[model samples]
Target: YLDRKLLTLEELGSTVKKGYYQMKKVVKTVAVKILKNPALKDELLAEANVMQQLDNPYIVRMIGICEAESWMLVMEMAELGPLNKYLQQNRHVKDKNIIELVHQVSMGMKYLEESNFVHRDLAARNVLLVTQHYAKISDFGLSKALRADENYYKAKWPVKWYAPECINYYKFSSKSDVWSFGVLMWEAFSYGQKPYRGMKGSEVTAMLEKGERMGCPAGCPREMYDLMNLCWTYDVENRPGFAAVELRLRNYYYDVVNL
Candidate 1:
């Protein structure tokens, strides 16, 4: 029955590899995802199968899954939880260090770009922190692997975090994701203030169509703000890809450190 493993493990730390933690999969020590609706559960299982193929240091590793009688996944634990958790509500951090925070996340996005995966939900909330200074991406619920010459017109995405073209045209691409990352960067600078200051989703779509983009968050550095602006460029053809973004962030971090 469903109650067979009432208190299965949520997170466990043991020998995984030279410098990783691994949680072996089994009925008693795995995470069971109980989706109330059958269709949604089946969809998650299929998506989980796609996500299982992803392996990178900056991405959360899925150890195991069970989809026969129950739906479950054994995911690695990240001690600091979501990347935005501390940045949004906690003690102060230096402005320069915030650049590092964005850089870490950008690195993960770079790896995804190289792997030909598009993270429809690439935001600070979807990124996890293994330590105060290190990050690992999680939440593959909205991810899709891309084949060359492919673009999606998916039902819906997080509007507040989406690119303008994505909202109006229903188009999605690495460039669109880059636009979202700019918003995520804004969040880092604003300490997690809500984007667009409570503008309705319909309002945002209309406003963006008029070529309106957000101003930089208060106290954001010029270079960092400039990079975000580039990501939000209206023409996808002109927007810098994640590799360029990653390099720009690396230089931004380096400059901050030397300042």
Candidate 2:
């Protein structure tokens, strides 16, 4: 019914001192994404163009693109599935372990932030787990840039993982990405629980307008929750950018390491 293939990616772990980081062989699967709507074929092509230019490790790299009766995107694969699905397969993730997962994501977001790319849609579903300790940010269909060419465009959002300005004014920026990252952090600590529970969309909008935010996920450190709050700050200028946020995550990790 669909074409299938495999592409391998090796894990170098950390390469602080290696002349060239280790390139352990990995059988990276070639995942298929279907574009049933033939009308959006151009959009899929544009997304592929964007993916090819991106060179971050945490961001899933697009190996190839194909077009036919229906368009399909061939992408790198992870042994473990999406973060939420991975969480469901396991019993528990230790505190430091969960922080490890969070750090991996933040580091990736840091690259995107510096690159001026706003992932309009960010959630556990968009994050793929290679291993519990490793994950990659996937699905860039809804991404846009601070300034982009004809190849780039925008779309409506589902509202659960978006910032207020993104919803009210249709504005997206690094700050808005930070907001989504905070929500992702919430999902991380909750072992991939849905954000905001089951509140209606209007309820979410009004509460966010009133400055209400989610409580810390069970077992998340107070310091980390504080960062999440900083991300959700209504004032755009008040929230720290991804660079600072990544540093905080690093500090938190190093502190735990030194203990």
Candidate 3:
């Protein structure tokens, strides 16, 4: 149900520099993600296995796959592209639009958490802004499938969006994802600003190692800011899970509409 074409390096976008595969005859629009040459030997198989296991609308749909002389994953193309790009071009979005976006992304994250999947990379750059203000989570390169009894903290160091417990003790759970969700909220409200501006990755790592935490910027709504602060709490047990996030965000939107 797929056709392959040889694409020169130039044809593919710079973001996806590792060549491309075009799928023909499929009813849905397709984008083939070729595995990076270096990562192919190490993590490509795991990536494929994870992608194959996921089946949710909030998550990007993996239509089909091809692993041959070259490794490629077939996925539906998000017509509107990455949310970061969309926000950059439309920075003056209305407050209501912003709330709606939060709802959409929270819904996606809720699904992932419900399925016991950890989206190690959950930022505007990895979320695609599809039409009707809908968003779909993408980039499974760092996703991990968690078993009922597995300890995620024993896993590798995740990005700083992770909870303090995760960063310091290497203990990750659904609560750790909730920490990332708070940072994601700041990213969305800020219209795609980088987390921890003016701080290098190493410096940020050092600070987190010393028990420092990142908080929302001044422009964020007080209520939203308070919610984010709760998310960034040093106590991992205090972090709100997806259920609380969904309810708070829903209430926030409802309150906004009546204002």
Best by lDDT: 2
Regions more than 4 Å wrong, model 2: 1-28, 148-156
lDDT of 1 by residue, 92-169 (tens): 866777788788888888888877787888887877777767778777777777876665435465898888777767
List clashing residue pairs in candidate 2: 7-28, 8-28
Rank by lDDT, highest first.
Answer: 2, 1, 3
Clashes counted in candidate 1 amount to 0
* Cα lDDT, model 1, residue 18: 17
TM-score of each: 0.84, 0.84, 0.83
The candidate, 2 or 3, that scores higher on TM-score is 2
1-259, model 3: which lDDT tens digit per residue? 2344433332244424333444354244556676556545457567767878888777787765565546667777777787767777887776578777777777777877888888777777778867737788888777788878763636644365766666567676767877887777788777878788887656877886686666655466778877877777667666777788878888998898888
Q: lDDT at 174 for candidate 1?
A: 76
Q: What lDDT does model 1 reach?
A: 0.72
Which candidate, 1 or 2, has the higher lDDT? 2
Model 1 weakest 10-residue run by lDDT: 11-20
